[PDB]
Scaffold this active site. Sequence first.
Site, short mmCIF file in Angstrom:
data_model
loop_
_atom_site.label_atom_id
_atom_site.label_comp_id
_atom_site.label_asym_id
_atom_site.label_seq_id
_atom_site.Cartn_x
_atom_site.Cartn_y
_atom_site.Cartn_z
N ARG A 63 75.07 40.18 76.30
CA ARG A 63 74.24 40.11 77.50
C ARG A 63 75.08 40.08 78.75
O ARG A 63 76.17 39.52 78.76
CB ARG A 63 73.33 38.87 77.49
CG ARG A 63 74.10 37.59 77.70
CD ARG A 63 73.22 36.32 77.51
NE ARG A 63 73.98 35.13 77.89
CZ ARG A 63 73.70 33.88 77.51
NH1 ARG A 63 72.65 33.62 76.73
NH2 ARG A 63 74.47 32.89 77.91
N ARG A 65 75.04 38.67 82.56
CA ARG A 65 74.35 37.61 83.29
C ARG A 65 74.84 37.48 84.73
O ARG A 65 76.02 37.65 85.00
CB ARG A 65 74.56 36.27 82.55
CG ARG A 65 74.20 35.02 83.37
CD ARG A 65 74.26 33.77 82.48
NE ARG A 65 73.15 33.73 81.53
CZ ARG A 65 72.75 32.63 80.90
NH1 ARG A 65 73.37 31.48 81.12
NH2 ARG A 65 71.71 32.68 80.05
N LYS A 80 78.05 36.49 72.24
CA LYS A 80 77.98 35.39 71.29
C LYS A 80 78.22 35.97 69.92
O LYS A 80 77.74 37.04 69.62
CB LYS A 80 76.58 34.77 71.29
CG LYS A 80 76.15 34.14 72.61
CD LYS A 80 74.80 33.41 72.40
CE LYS A 80 74.39 32.62 73.62
NZ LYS A 80 73.27 31.67 73.27
N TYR A 158 65.13 32.78 84.43
CA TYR A 158 64.54 31.47 84.69
C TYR A 158 65.21 30.86 85.90
O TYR A 158 66.23 31.36 86.36
CB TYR A 158 64.67 30.55 83.48
CG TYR A 158 66.08 30.25 83.00
CD1 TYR A 158 66.75 31.13 82.16
CD2 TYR A 158 66.71 29.05 83.34
CE1 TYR A 158 68.02 30.84 81.69
CE2 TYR A 158 68.00 28.76 82.88
CZ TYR A 158 68.64 29.67 82.05
OH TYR A 158 69.91 29.42 81.57
N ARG A 160 66.90 27.32 87.28
CA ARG A 160 67.44 26.06 86.79
C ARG A 160 67.69 25.12 87.96
O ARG A 160 68.30 25.51 88.95
CB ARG A 160 68.74 26.28 86.01
CG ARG A 160 69.34 25.01 85.40
CD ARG A 160 70.62 25.32 84.63
NE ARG A 160 71.29 24.11 84.13
CZ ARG A 160 72.13 23.37 84.85
NH1 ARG A 160 72.41 23.70 86.10
NH2 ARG A 160 72.70 22.30 84.31
N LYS A 257 66.00 33.36 73.21
CA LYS A 257 65.18 34.14 74.14
C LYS A 257 65.29 35.62 73.85
O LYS A 257 64.32 36.36 74.08
CB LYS A 257 65.59 33.89 75.59
CG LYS A 257 65.42 32.46 76.04
CD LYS A 257 65.76 32.33 77.51
CE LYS A 257 65.61 30.89 77.95
NZ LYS A 257 66.28 30.68 79.25
#
Length: 274
Positions: A63, A65, A80, A158, A160, A257
Amino acid sequence: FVRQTTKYWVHPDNITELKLIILKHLPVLEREDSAITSIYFDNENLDLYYGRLRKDEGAEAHRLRWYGGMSTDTIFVERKTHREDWTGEKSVKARFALKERHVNDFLKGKYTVDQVFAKMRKEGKKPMNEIENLEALASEIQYVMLKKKLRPVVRSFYNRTAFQLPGDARVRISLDTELTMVREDNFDGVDRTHKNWRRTDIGVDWPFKQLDDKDICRFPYAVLEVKLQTQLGQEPPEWVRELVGSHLVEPVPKFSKFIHGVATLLNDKVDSIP
């Protein structure tokens, strides 16, 4: 002291009441600054999704980010890797930073690993063994991107907010809200990205009203994370014990997710759903 980290799900319409309670005890540590957006990559066969769902030894998730709004230039390229207990190794997370203008080119192999790390090698501020590590990482990402024909598939978004008293680590809390997944793929013949690493018809302007609402999954919970450092043998503050024991929150297990987004938004395409 002993540590504990716990995540809880929260009904969206209890968010304000929950924040008010936290704020009695811990202060908050543009509105866009709190955004966290990740673009997950996969291919037409959803190979990475199935690998992660099944927890295959070595299964990677990829991913890209960024933190904050659309003026943020630092993009984190992240991988990951799942390791099975029988290997004796722990699963690993790794990342490196790239300027946004190099992302498409890097993923395509037009911007090379040597180019990515030239300046950081020149300034020699980073230990060379770490640079080597980052080079192996970048190359391996570049390779799977090409070999597995990966492309953007789903975005997670999202906000945070973190709460913390300076110099007191007994309790630290974060609250993730506006949890959303958005399609980034082209599997239905709709070209969402136009060759870019992320769609650009949205920014961090949740809830993304300008989009086809079938492209969006609004998660039905917010997530509370409480981290404790408790002197053995004392107790966590009474207010935290009360909060976490109340009807406002419920403990939850690890939840992907990436997997939830694919399974929900591309439900017609998957043949295994959590």
